Amino acid sequence: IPSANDKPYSSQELFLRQLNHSMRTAKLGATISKVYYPHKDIFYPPLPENITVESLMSAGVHLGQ
């Protein structure tokens, strides 16, 4: 329900105004490299041929009981 052009933004409009900022501006200034994101293990798993000892070790697979 858009608000009148004279009235201030509603709570819903502020949320959509923030979502617009999040897509464009919020990620300006730098990119992030070589940082582990937990979700990417599930959604971007590597292929078996590209797995290294380093990758297995980074995941903690070597830590037994």
Added chain:
RNA sequence: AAUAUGAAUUAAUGCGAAGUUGAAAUACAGUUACCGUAGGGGAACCUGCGGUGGGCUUAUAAAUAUCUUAAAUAUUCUUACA
């Protein structure tokens, strides 16, 4: 002297039925049982001394618990970013 036989005479024991006097054992069996040994008692048994567990491992709380960006940021994310 040995072997065999019978033997006066005399000792131990099994089974069978079948009651009698008690109630010793199996449960904490109503006094823990049993082993060795000694004494005593109608009968099982009772008592002393040490031993054994084939009886007590059957074992189960005097309680007290802590601070960093709660999110425009983690929570979403589908091979993308890099």
